[PDB]
Amino acid sequence: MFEIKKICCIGAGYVGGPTCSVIAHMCPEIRVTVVDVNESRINAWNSPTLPIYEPGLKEVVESCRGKNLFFSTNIDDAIKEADLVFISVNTPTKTYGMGKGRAADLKYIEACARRIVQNSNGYKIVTEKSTVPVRAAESIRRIFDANTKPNLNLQVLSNPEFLAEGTAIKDLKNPDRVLIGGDETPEGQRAVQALCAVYEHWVPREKILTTNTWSSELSKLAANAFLAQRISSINSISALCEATGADVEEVATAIGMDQRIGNKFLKASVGFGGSCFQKDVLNLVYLCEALNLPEVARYWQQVIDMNDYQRRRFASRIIDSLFNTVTDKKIAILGFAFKKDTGDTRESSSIYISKYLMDEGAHLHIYDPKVPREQIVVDLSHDQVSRLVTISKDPYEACDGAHAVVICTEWDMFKELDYERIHKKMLKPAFIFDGRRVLDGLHNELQTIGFQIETIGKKV
Amino acid sequence: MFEIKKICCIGAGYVGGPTCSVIAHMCPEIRVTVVDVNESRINAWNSPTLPIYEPGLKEVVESCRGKNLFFSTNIDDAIKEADLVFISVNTPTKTYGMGKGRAADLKYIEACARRIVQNSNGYKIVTEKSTVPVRAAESIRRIFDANTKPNLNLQVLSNPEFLAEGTAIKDLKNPDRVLIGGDETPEGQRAVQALCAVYEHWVPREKILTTNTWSSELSKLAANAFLAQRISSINSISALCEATGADVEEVATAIGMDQRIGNKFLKASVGFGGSCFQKDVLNLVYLCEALNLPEVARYWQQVIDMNDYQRRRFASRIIDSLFNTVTDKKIAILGFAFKKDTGDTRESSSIYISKYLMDEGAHLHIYDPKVPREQIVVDLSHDQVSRLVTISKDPYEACDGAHAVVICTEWDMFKELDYERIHKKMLKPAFIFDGRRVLDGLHNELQTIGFQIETIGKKV
Amino acid sequence: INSISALCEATGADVEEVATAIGMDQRIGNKFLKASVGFGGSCFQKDVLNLVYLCEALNLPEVARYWQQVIDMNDYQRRRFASRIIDSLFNTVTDKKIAILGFAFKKDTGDTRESSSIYISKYLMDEGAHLHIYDPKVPREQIVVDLSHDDQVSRLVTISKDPYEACDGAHAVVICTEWDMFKELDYERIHKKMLKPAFIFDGRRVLDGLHNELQTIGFQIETIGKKV
């Protein structure tokens, strides 16, 4: 049974970086080399300051860098040496052509496949770790076969990432499961077992699941779809709550106490964000359309439609409360990141709430304690931003003479604001629109102060 | 704080019967009286043989019947005596008028409300335990107010059932949670706490959740919707698996190992059945339409559409494999109950698979080890049944000269059949259509024997 | 016959065999039954569209939609072909070199009016392909004009002086015009310098009979009305 001594990962992103650092950390006898075409990242990884921030990562890297962990721009050589090649390049959504806005672009993956076969000889296991569309491994095999050589035996595996950015290290050292898909043939099985062996250094064999390569690719998309579906389901319920007098936090709790349902991913909000949920559901939907499965496509499209409905519904409540006119009205936007405790704004609901309000000609004053100023301007551009967008240094500068305060990100600090002070300098009637249920418990307080406070999933 | 000494439950169904028997069993100091207009049930409950079968129930009843547990047809007197009144009558789906086929008919609940107020005086807590549409408790309160008396104080609570028929006793003695909804006013809170006190006799206070009355009603519908959604989601995936070469059992496993998703209710099949899932989702959908929430209605309608698609897709695979002609072809239908280990056929997928095949003029031979013969004939009627339906005494009589064997219920015995014997007497080519993944592991065997075996979520 | 060609690809039938069997009926006759990527010319679409408008103006919508089908099928035929190419290249054509052999609407002319090559090229341009176009008769400036609205043509379109310069390092060869000279090319030479896997998409059935040759060479060859 083949043993893996040298590993090359293509891509120094948040996936390939931490995963290989951990592998190096739990497998001192293996030489792991992370490469990327970006000289900036590579030199940063070998620098005292790392190009990405993860809790516990800095310690892992400094423990291994120089012994068995190496970051280089020399991709060709790292490929030649390696027994295992992780393909960890991103697959952006197509911005044009067939599948525009939904289909995954395999351009970078195909580039890796051609680069690998070019610079490699003998036996090598090639593993796709980045999120790929289903049957992408067929595409890789097809490149390998057409570009074959004597004594060339490249085995293709699937081993998707399941780490949430922010807790990468914890997710890697103590994963719920490791997933490995390979062809159900003697050759494919030997390659799967070799990859297992690497993980067996720190992952119990009970938590390692082996499947065929297509089940593995599809599992990654479906898992994210199921998670997203849970959120959109509780959100659809929140709309019912507002219409019936029920309360979504009460309903979520009652639902989640069913062992079969569980209590995770049931917190209603203005809408899910992030670079994964919408991207992977849209890719799942495109897959179904391509495979002549329109009933399944429209089933999963509902997850996205509900999320868009949730955001639009929220903006509409704000606009109607301000008498369907927001021209030149000051509106405080507290929180711009897609979730708390991060600077990431990718697919942030704040972007969509802000944009709806901008279409009304609102004067938005945006505050976020972590998100860089230049990022907010970028996320709101296509002139219009110049006229309507002010970026506040502090929350009180954003609520000074504002008609309404809109909370879009569940930052802990928003709970602790001096709402007595804020109310004194707001225009009356003064509104608070809680899009994250963060001011729950503070309702009676804010109302006696004088606020009109509205929130997701609670009847007005 | 008020104490409940006498309890009257209206309805000796599978809900009111076991729940009150258990209450009597864990609260010897409380006198519980179960009533129903059906003299048949009542005399059966007081008979050595009980009108329903639940594991451990017979022992519970015989322990309490005569001390604090009583079954009577004397509804008026049981109401007069009781401190707490459980309303446990069923709410059938409307078969005509506004909301036909979706809306719940509140006729029996309203009848109980008028009967209660008629035969009652003083303080009484009235609790709806049966599954009701949201704001049904408003309907009950509206009857009580209009029919008021001096010294009449009827408090209305919601306390939905969460017991799966078949494990009622286990679900009652060790519930995941007890749900109690009441009006958020001093009066309503006192009534909620009184009902809690009853459950505190055997249920830890951590597992008792109190909400307002609308959250409670909605939680019961949403919980069943979420469960059903899980099944339809894995089913939609099974269709993708058949089209890609992935395997749904492998995918379900990989998905379910995520702690946040969990591994319950992820077993793909020909479609979910039962008297709860479709009924409550349709009621949830009607609720949304009535409340001008068309985006939410169509979101949840997808759960049902997918389930119907799953069944139709299955039948179509069978029909196409038999060259789109099934006229006078013998087809074995193994399993008619909606799930294994029961005689219940309500909304059984076997009904729909059978009916699709009957529309092709098939000669169906149906076998189920538990389902009564007369029930199958009833479930397939509106002449047509006489011509096309034969009910087999044993599985081999159903597979004698049949073109295909269709498994619709996951009975354990189907795994153990003499498939060598069956194949010898089948017409060639001989098909097995596994609608429950029960013959998983037996694939290579059945194929070497000579079967063409197809199943849910596996590429052919 | 083009609609039939789509059915042939899905059944294992062959459109040229079907066309012959049909055309041997005296009542149907054998002219105008050669399946292709789509008809072109300055007459067919123009006159059918005029016929349809006439029907609409005269309150004859059933007749209008009957004839509209001729145009819809022709548009479907072109789209279907372009999509086969795109899907075969893994649904990504960004910066992929693709040779387009033939630009005129039919062989033995410089006329490009309503040529199917224009529409196939544009579909591939919307994918970001690097098209290298060759036609022995069509003037260079005409091709540039027919692909404009600009900068997109500047970035994505190169016009080759000879076919081999267009197939040098290309992922796929797309034949859109039935020039006789395309049948006589040195496909052994072309394959050596193409990126692998190397595709040929025959949109005019000109390479019929040469399939086994091209397959033993190493080509993956696909065409109108023949199952893959």
Curated annotation (Swiss-Prot), chain C:
Tissue localization of expression: Detected in heart, placenta, liver, pancreas, spleen, thymus, prostate, ovary, small intestine and colon. Widely expressed.
Q: What is the effect of changing residue 38 to R?
A: In DEE84; uncertain significance
The reported result of mutating residue 204 to W is: In DEE84; uncertain significance
Cite the binding residues for substrate.
Answer: 27, 34-40, 105-106, 204
Superkingdom of source: Eukaryota
The UniProt subunit note reads as follows: Homohexamer.
Tell me the domain comment: The protein goes through several conformation states during the reaction cycle, giving rise to hysteresis. In the initial state, the ligand-free protein is in an inactive conformation (E*). Substrate binding triggers a change to the active conformation (E). UDP-xylose binding triggers the transition to a distinct, inhibited conformation. The presence of an intrinsically disordered C-terminus promotes a more dynamic protein structure and favors a conformation with high affinity for UPD-xylose. The allosteric switch region moves by about 5 Angstroms when UDP-xylose is bound, and occupies part of the UDP-glucose binding site. At the same time it promotes domain movements that disrupt the active hexameric ring structure and lead to the formation of a horseshoe-shaped, inactive hexamer.
Q: What does this protein do?
A: Catalyzes the formation of UDP-alpha-D-glucuronate, a constituent of complex glycosaminoglycans. Required for the biosynthesis of chondroitin sulfate and heparan sulfate. Required for embryonic development via its role in the biosynthesis of glycosaminoglycans. Required for proper brain and neuronal development.
Family assignment? Belongs to the UDP-glucose/GDP-mannose dehydrogenase family.
Q: Can you say what this protein is called?
A: UDP-glucose 6-dehydrogenase
Write down the species.
Answer: Homo sapiens
Q: Which residues of the full protein are shown?
A: 234 to 466 of 494
